[PDB]
Structure formats: structure tokens, C-alpha cells
Amino acid sequence: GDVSGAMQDIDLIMDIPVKLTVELGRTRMTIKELLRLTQGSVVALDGLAGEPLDILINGYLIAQGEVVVVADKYGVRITDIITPSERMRRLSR
Amino acid sequence: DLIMDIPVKLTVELGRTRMTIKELLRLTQGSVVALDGLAGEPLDILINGYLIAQGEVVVVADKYGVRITDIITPSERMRRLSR
Amino acid sequence: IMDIPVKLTVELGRTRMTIKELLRLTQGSVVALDGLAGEPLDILINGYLIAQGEVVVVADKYGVRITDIITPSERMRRLSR
Amino acid sequence: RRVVRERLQALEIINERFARQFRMGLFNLLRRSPDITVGAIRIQPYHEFARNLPVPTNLNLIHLKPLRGTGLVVFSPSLVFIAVDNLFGGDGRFPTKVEGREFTHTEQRVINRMLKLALEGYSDAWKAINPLEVEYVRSEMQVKFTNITTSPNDIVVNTPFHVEIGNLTGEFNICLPFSMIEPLRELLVNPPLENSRHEDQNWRDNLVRQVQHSELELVANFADIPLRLSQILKLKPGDVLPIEKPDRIIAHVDGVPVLTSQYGTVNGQYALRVEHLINPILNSLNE
Amino acid sequence: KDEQLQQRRANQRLGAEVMSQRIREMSDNDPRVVALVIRQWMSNDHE
Amino acid sequence: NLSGTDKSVILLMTIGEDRAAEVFKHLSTREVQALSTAMANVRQISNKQLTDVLSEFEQEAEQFAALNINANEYLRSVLVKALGEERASSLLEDILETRDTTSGIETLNFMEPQSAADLIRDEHPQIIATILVHLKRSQAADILALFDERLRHDVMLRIATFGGVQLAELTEVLNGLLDGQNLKRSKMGGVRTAAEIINLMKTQQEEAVITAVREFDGELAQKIIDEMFLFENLVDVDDRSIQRLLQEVDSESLLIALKGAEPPLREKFLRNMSQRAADILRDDLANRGPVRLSQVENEQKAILLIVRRLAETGEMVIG
């Protein structure tokens, strides 16, 4: 049942491992540029210094967060949960 | 449950076999290997490498369609992983 | 050089949607995948891919007709998809 | 469980030009212009082909080196009767039908010449695109004795032809196992290629010159930690998830990695310091 | 049987003549080989 | 005896392999092997004989050969040289096949029409049509009659359709037919010989095998019994023939065979007696009782032997 399937996942799929991904920034760069690039080259990204990094799972937008050096151990601290309207606005760009 | 709308990755398998690397050394690129699950047994249905259920593939609507038949059944999951 | 038994894995295609559309369908619901009739399958070892090959049935038992070790080229495409 | 579905382009025109060459050959051989109508290429299991095969008939084995296995060509008793009486010059408007009776020596010899003529026609037609030598092996009267395929359910591709000489008509088929064309599965699907002279090569290089300024976006990843949707649901904004030390940054486009890099603080920007481009050729050379 | 002995001597002379006839047949086989083949065909036709 | 074939054979066994090879290549396999056997085992050698053989060869050389250049032996090679010098078309080879084809057509006319038919029934009906057109009209009519009705009508219809009069394909068609009789003649079918062999056997074993083959195949057994039949009914045997045989056959032998024979046989045999002979035979049949069945069968076998002798003479059709 549709309701049964929705109800099942809250308990049956409650215990299930998943994956995630995080992105730093985006820059326009073409094959001429990559061929010209060499060892030790530095490339910047549109992500401003200190900007929280977007957090996604299997390529699906989830949230945004920033890494913090706690106990000399890096850890991303999320700051928001993307709303459907803000997600629509983000993809409408 | 705002995270309800999340694309999941599923995994469907046929069967397993405990073969040593020497067997694969002699098995040519066109070799034949059997499995443990007998023919006709419902193929195990899993997601991201995690056990879920089982189902059988049938040639319907000109495509291979697996038919979900069993539920996650955590007791049966415990029994299965106890192997 | 040293030999040891190892777990294999065969995968019959991968789809792209939430499990809710699948779990809402109760037991006895037939669902298809990107795995169609005709394409050879893939073999993984401990989750690490090796080769491609169709699987047939013989002596009331499944028999894989493996073809050739999967090269990193098409490994990249199958990782992307 | 054996199902295979595919479409081909080159073999259609190959069969068409082969049929035109065969029509010319029969015209000059029998001093009368024939007409060959190529039927729609048939794809069926070997048992289905054997069942559809009109018994009695003559089956011929023609090996295709260097590919393993032997090819098959068949002809109808009506066709061989009509061809041989046209060789005799007879009208054939009062024909006879032979069933079960094996072909006489003269009939089999006329079969031999027409077989070699068909072999030469198909050879020139095929070598016009891909040079694959054809060598006859052994004629056969019953399909079961031909036993080319491993199993009767093995899928065999067949090209039917409808050949007529004036009022007299006929049909013959050229059938081949799918395993025979398995090595050239890509070459059969695509239509043949025009040119391929030195200019075409440089034109392809010129295409790469135009493709030099392409449009692509790179993707940078830091951590891919396996967690649970239970944890995600119980996760709230402000929560911090520990991350192992990212000794390098992997760069990929549409999924395929291209290089590795190290993050750096340059001009107040999320800058990455590349180490080396990850090329498949470089990886193969290293391995 | 002195006459029989003379007949045997005549037979020996006939044998020498037969050897000469065989040599003549060999000469016919030897010279004009074409003509020998033509005579072969002619004898076959007469056969 | 020394026939023209035998004279050439003696010539060959006298001269040697130098001309024997040319004779073989211009000759046929059975005569080649006959001369090989003659070389292997020879007892026809004499001082005068060999010289006479050389003289006969000289006669053949001055007459049959007429001291001419190799006849189609080395000439065919120069003919091929001219053919090669002229257009690239082996017409001479086609003419060679035509020569065998025409000779085979004449042979076809000579040999048995029904055997020709069954050798050509399997072949193409157009082959039958064209070969029948090219054959003699009488031989063609014989083969036409020996054909079945439907095949015969198809052959004549395709004769009407036959207008291509083709050109070297016809020659090799006859060559194939000749090769299908070129194989050892055999002809050991002996459709009559079974019957003949059983007649040569004892009469009781003859009847036993007749019953056995009746069980095997009433048709084949009935054919064998027909082959046994020899002057059993007047109408088929012909009275004029019963008249002619039985005056040649001894009257006493006829009497002895008849008193052991059936009364219908006695009546049909005596109907061709001179009336005095018939009356004498019947009176003696009444007088003497049935003599030993061995002697009765001996007289019957003598009657059959005289029937076979007159069949050898061939003046009339026995039965």
C-alpha cells in the first residue's frame, strides 16, 4: 500500500546506511586551459574564503556546512536545511 | 521527514560462490562459473550493498522486471547475516 | 601470489529514484530496471568490478558467460552511471 | 533465456550491392537478366530458422576466416531447377517438384557453380568494405546435420532474397549465427564511412581544433562519509560531522576524475594547487 | 635327329631375326615418334 | 582366334611400354588392364610370331596409320596452341566433349531404351527433352513408350518448349549421362536369373522357395513363378510354337513327361500333335502307369532344355 510503503520506511528503512558528498567551488575552464596548466599550478574557485561548503548526497542537494578544526580533526558543521522553495530558486539560475 | 525525497541506489544479485584466486587465474576470459542460488530462486534485492528483500525477474512488457515478494523482515535479516 | 577465497558480486543494473515508489508497491509487484534483455552483465569482487558477461542457465543452475576484463575506460562510464 | 535485440545499417546496403552483383553474374551466366528482391533481414533462433527452412533443400558451409565458425547459405529446389533449365535454355513452364529425393550429380554440380558464383559475389561485396575471406567447407542436405550453432536456440541472422527470371521466380536465404558477427557487433550497426582519405583524417584533426575551446565544469570533492538516514533525520543545523584528513582534492567532470590537487589559501579564495593531471594513459603506463 | 638339330639352328636364326624384328619395332617406336602415336591411334581404332 | 582388337593387343604386348602408354591414353581402362595382364603373364611368344607381328604393325603403319603425323595425339596439342594463339575460348575442348556427346548419343540409341530412361528419369526433364530431340526418332519413341504417362507428357511438352538448342552445356550433360553408364557395366540384375537359378535347382526346393518368396512379397514371388513358367498354357505359349517344339522333342519323352504332368498340360501339348501321334501318346498313357517321378522330371527338364535351345535359335517367341 502507498500509505503502508510510506509507513514502512520510517521503521524498516530507519536503520539503513547512506552516502554523501561535499563540493568546494565551480570555475569555467576549458581543454585549452587544462592543457596549458602544469605541475604545481594554483586554481581558485568561486567559493569565497570562509563560505560554507554545499553538502549533497548522491548528487542531491541536502544542506550547506563549513569545516571546523576541532581537536585537530576536521569536521563540517552544517548550518541550514534547504527548503524546497530555496532549492527551486537555486536551480533556477 | 523532509529527507523522504532522496534518490536511492539499489543492487540486485544472482548468487555467490567461494572461489580462490587460483581458480580465477585459470578461468579464461570466456569461462563459465556457477553460483549457490538455484535457478528460479527469487533474486535478492539490495540497496547500496545493504540487504533489503528478494524478487524474481520476468519477461513482461518486453523488459526484464523483478517482482518484489518479501519484506525486509529484520528477524530474517538477522538470520541471513548470521552466516 | 598467495591465494585466498574471495567474495564476488554480480549486479543487474541500477536505477534512479526514491525507494518510496518501490516500497509503496506491495509484495507481488513487478518492477523493471535499466537491465534489459540482451546486454551482458558485470562481475564484481568484494565490490570491485572485473569483467562483463551474460549469464545463462545450465543443469538447473546459473552459468555466467563472461566476456573480458572491464577496462578503466568503460569503468569510468559505468561509475558515472 | 536468450533474448537479443539490435538494429544494423551497413549490412543492408552490403546485401543490396551483393544482390546487384549477383544479378549481373546470373545475367551474364544465363544470357538472361534476372531480378533479385532482397527480403527483410531475418533475426531468429537457429531452431526457428531450421523450422522455417523449406525441407528438402541444400545447405552449404562456407567458413569465414579469421573469425571462428562457418557460414551458411541455402537455395530452393525451385530456384535450382529454374536456373539449371535456363542453363539448358528450356522454358520450364511445365516444371517438376522433387521432395526427399537427393540431388543428382548434375544437379549438385550446377549447385557447385552457382555456389561458387555466389561466393565470389559476396566476397567482392564484403571486401568492398571489410576484407574477410570466405571459404566453402561442405554442402549439406538437412539442417540438423549442419549443426553450426552450439544450441538450436542460438540466435541466427538471416538475409532472405527473392530471385526471379521473367515468369520463373524463386527465393533463397543467407543465414548466419549471431556469434559469427559478435566480434564485429559495432561495425554492423553503423552505416559505412565515406572518404577516410588523408583529407578526412586532417578534417577530423580540424574538428579537434574547433573542439579545443570546449565548455566543461569541474567538480571538487572533500569527504564522502558513509552515514545513515536515521542520523540525517536526527541531524539538525549547527551539527558538526568529523572528517578524516583530506590529504588531496579529487577533481572530476561528470564523474570521471581528471586530476588531484591540494587546497590553498590564495588571495582570499578557495584555491586548489594541482599536483598532476590524472590521465587514463598515464595510469596505464604506470601500471 | 640331325635334321631336328638343323631345325633348332634355323629356329635360333629365326630368334636372331625376331630380335632384329624387335629392333625394327623399337626403331619404329624410336624414329617418327609422332608417326608411332598416329599408328597407336590407328591400331586402337582398328581394335 | 585373332580379331582386329586381338591383333592390336598382340602388337602391343610385342612392342612395349613406349607405344603402350600412348595406346593407353588413347584407349580404355579394361583394355589397358588386359595388356597389363598380358605383360604380367605372356605365353604367345615365338621367333616367327614376333616377326609376323612386326610385319602386321608395318602393314597398320602403311595402311591404318598410312605413315601420317600423330593423329590427335600431338596434333591436339598444336590445335590447343592455335586455340591459345586465337581467342581465349576452348572451342576445341567443347568440340572434344561434343565428339563424346555425339558418340554417346549413338551409344544411347544402341543401348536399351528403358535403361536409358531410368538413367535419365532422375535427371532434369529438360535434359530428357533435349536428349530425346537429339536422339534417333525410333529410340526416342521407345523411351517415350517406356516412360510413365505423366513423365512422358511432361517430356514432350518440354520438347515443345525446347528452342534454346544449347551451346556447350548440352555436351557435358551427355558426358554426365555417359559417366553414369561409364562405371563398370554390371547389368548383373538378372531379372530372369533368379527364376533361372530356381529352375536350375531341384523342383521341390524350387516350390519351397516359391512359397517362401510368396510370403516375402507376393509380387516378387509371382514374378519368380512366372520365370518358372515355361509352356504351361497354349494361348500364351502359341499353338504354332507347341507344334514346332514337340515335333523336335522325342515323342516318348513327351509321353513320359505328360503322364506325370497335369491333364490340361497333356491336352494342350497333344493338341499340336499329328493326330496319329496324339492317339498313340494317349493310348500309351492309358497303357503304362506313371513311371518314376525322377524319370518324369528328367523328361520335363529335357522338354525345358529343348525350349531353351529353340529360344537360343530365336525363330519364334517362347511363351
Numbering used by the authors:
A (entry chain N): 45 to 137
B (entry chain P): 55 to 137
C (entry chain Q): 57 to 137
D (entry chain M): 44 to 330
E (entry chain F): 514 to 560
F (entry chain G): 3 to 168, 172 to 324
Paper text:
Rotation is driven by a flagellar motor, which is a supercomplex containing multiple rings. The C-ring (C = cytoplasmic), which contains multiple copies of protein subunits called FliG, FliM and FliN, switches the rotation of the flagellum between counterclockwise (CCW) and clockwise (CW). The switch is also the site of torque generation for the flagellum, through an electrostatic interaction with a stator called MotA/B4. The switch also connects to the MS-ring (MS = membrane–supramembrane), which transmits both the direction and the speed of rotation to the flagellar rod.
In one of our CW switchΔPAA datasets, we observed density for a binding partner within the cleft in the FliG subunit. The bound protein moved both FliFC/FliGD1/D2 of the inner ring and FliGD5 of the outer ring, as a unit, by ~10 Å toward the centre of the ring. One of our CW data sets showed density within an ~40 Å cleft between FliG domains, identifying one binding site for regulatory proteins. The size of the density is consistent with a globular domain of ~120 amino acids. Because it bridges FliFC/FliGD1 and FliGD5, which differ between CCW and CW, this protein should be specific for the CW pose. The local resolution for this density was 9 Å, making it difficult to identify the species from the maps. YcgR and CheY could be docked, while quinol:fumarate reductase and FliO fit the density poorly. Thus, we cannot identify the bound species.
